[PDB]
Design a protein around this ligand. Structure first.
Ligand SMILES: [Cl-]
Ligand SMILES: [Cl-]
Ligand SMILES: [Cl-]
Ligand SMILES: [Cl-]
Ligand SMILES: [Cl-]
Lengths: 461, 105
């Protein structure tokens, strides 16, 4: 492609943003200045991301371009790229591209980034057999047959309507594959991709992971949000360092016991009641066990390298197994049955402490945790051991602020009253129980919350 | 207080990352999702402000991702804010300040 005559920059590049970019590239003073075809032929690379460019009209004259970045613009038509056969790398994520037919004969491409566009039809990619990086996620692709001949691919992603992975069968060079947010149940084809190092398959419909058995080079695996229960196959994957199996229906963790290279393990929203298989995973820094059926967390005391731990939405009474985990920076255990937080005094590095919806009455163990910047202590609730019903019932207030001061009740049931430190009721008739509430804003270090709760006192006939 | 029902891991990203983008950093979550559908967004320079779209979050799942290589020398630190709203658009959490550190690579 050649301009007929020396032409002003703003007559070649019709997009205002592009013209201004091209002015600087061509070392001209004004966009009105004339440039020659010889000037245009000197441009071999173009970094034009985030410029609000709506049209690449004019780029067909940059015959010698090998690398372009038009990511994060407002591009639709990409026709001016059609004959730029020297192109090796294209960055074009975050545009409005639907028709990629102009890429069809760009056979020298080894890198093509197209994620976050409006692409459905990828048939124009079929002949781009030198590709080693191809990114197609956040599109509306359902048919990946055009990928079958891309036998040099090392990294691949796509979405978001794919069910059939059979076109991946001969892509044995693949090392990184992200199929997140598709409609995949059958991953048997993945067994053929024996070079895979990372497999991200979040939010699919996968229930059978036996195809992963021979994929022993896998070091990163995400199967978050699938249909997993039995995970025996994972025992074969001894090189795994990062494993995400959250939001499945897993109960049996025995297959993970030998995976000692694990540093990050995500297991929230499962069916777990027994974590003893995790006891030997001593390299763990991040462990997520939220939304399970845990009571006994004793195996956690072994995990000396943890800096991040989640345990919220379980059935835990005894939090003390975390006491030796002195590297903990963030600890989440809201929605459990923990009353005694004495063991947490040991956690001097704790920055985020989330403990709402437990049975905590005494904040005094947290007094020296002055590095806290985020704190949650709202909505505690507990039931005291029963006392005998009497016409006049008195109990001591046990609610202690971080300073050691008793927090006076906010409300007291059945007309009861408070004279520090005693809560007293006058009951004209037997009642099964009495209660009181408290609510107290508090700051520890820099972390602020409302320490609040309801205390139930059963009365025996 | 400001913590509300947020559950957020610390966020760090090596500079000069290679291979395929986008890359998952952390999942952001609000426990307000137990009672209502929660919709996530991020604001700040590197998100909705220049450089825009360096970081993105999945609206429904809360997965925070990076879209390109970083350079600590250029920008060492990004200050973002995570947001959580219900189907009506009303915030179920107080915006949490998220700090993304760029490390070596
Ligand atoms: Cl113009
Ligand atoms: Cl440039
Ligand atoms: Cl989870
Ligand atoms: Cl929590
Ligand atoms: Cl705070």
């Amino acid at each position: 492609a050649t301009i007929t005559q020396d032409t002003p920059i703003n007559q070649i590049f019709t997009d205002t943003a592009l013209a201004e970019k091209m002015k600087t590239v061509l070392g001209k003073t004004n966009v009105t200045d004339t440039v020659s075809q010889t000037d245009l032929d000197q441009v071999t690379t173009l970094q034009a991301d985030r410029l609000g460019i709506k049209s690449i009209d004019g780029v067909e004259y940059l015959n010698n371009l090998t690398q372009i970045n038009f990511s994060n613009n407002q591009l639709t038509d990409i026709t001016p790229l059609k004959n730029l056969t020297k192109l090796v790398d294209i960055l074009m994520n975050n545009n409005q591209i639907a028709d990629i037919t102009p890429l069809a004969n760009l056979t020298n491409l080894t890198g093509l980034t197209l994620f976050n566009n409006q692409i459905t039809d990828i048939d124009p990619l079929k002949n781009l057999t030198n590709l080693n990086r191809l990114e197609l996620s956040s599109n509306t692709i359902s048919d990946i047959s055009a990928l079958s001949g891309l036998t040099s691919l090392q990294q691949l992603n796509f979405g978001n309507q794919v069910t059939d992975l059979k076109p991946l069968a001969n892509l044995t060079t693949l090392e990184r594959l992200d199929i997140s947010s598709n409609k995949v149940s059958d991953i048997s084809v993945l067994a053929k991709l024996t070079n895979l190092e990372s497999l991200i398959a979040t939010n699919n419909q996968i229930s059978d992971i036996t195809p992963l058995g021979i994929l022993t080079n896998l070091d990163e695996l995400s199967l978050n949000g699938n249909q997993l229960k039995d995970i025996g196959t994972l025992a074969s994957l001894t090189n795994l360092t990062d494993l995400d199996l959250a939001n499945n229906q897993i109960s049996n963790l025995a297959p993970l016991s030998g995976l000692t290279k694990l540093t990050e393990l995500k297991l929230g929203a499962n069916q777990i009641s027994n974590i003893s298989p995790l006891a030997g995973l001593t390299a763990l820094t991040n462990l997520e066990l939220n939304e399970n059926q845990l009571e006994d967390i004793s195996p956690i005391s072994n995990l000396k390298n943890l800096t991040y731990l989640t345990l919220y939405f379980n059935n835990i009474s005894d939090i003390s197994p975390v006491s030796s985990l002195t590297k903990l920076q963030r600890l989440f255990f809201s929605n459990n049955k923990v009353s005694d937080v004495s063991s947490l005094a040991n956690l001097t590095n704790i920055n985020w402490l989330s403990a709402g919806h437990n049975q905590i009455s005494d904040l005094t163990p947290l007094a020296n945790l002055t590095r806290i910047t985020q704190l949650g202590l709202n909505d505690q609730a507990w039931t005291n051991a029963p006392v005998n019903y009497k016409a006049n019932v008195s109990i001591p207030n046990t609610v202690k602020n971080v300073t050691g001061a008793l927090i006076a009740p906010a409300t007291i049931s059945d007309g009861g009253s408070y004279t520090e430190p005693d809560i007293t009721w006058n009951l004209p008739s037997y009642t099964n129980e009495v209660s009181y509430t408290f609510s107290q804003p508090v700051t520890i270090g820099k972390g602020t919350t409302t320490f609040s709760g309801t205390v139930t006192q059963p009365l025996k006939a | 207080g400001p913590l509300g029902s947020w559950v957020i891991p610390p966020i760090s990203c090596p500079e000069n990352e290679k291979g395929e983008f986008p890359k998952n950093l952390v999942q952001i979550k609000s426990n307000r999702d137990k009672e209502t559908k929660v919709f996530y967004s991020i604001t700040g320079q590197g998100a909705d402000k220049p450089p825009v779209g360096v970081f993105i979050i999945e609206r429904e799942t809360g997965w925070l991702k990076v879209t390109q290589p970083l350079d600590r020398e250029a920008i060492a630190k990004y200050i973002l804010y995570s947001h959580a709203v219900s189907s009506n658009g009303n915030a179920v959490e107080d915006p949490m300040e998220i700090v993304i550190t760029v490390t070596d690579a």
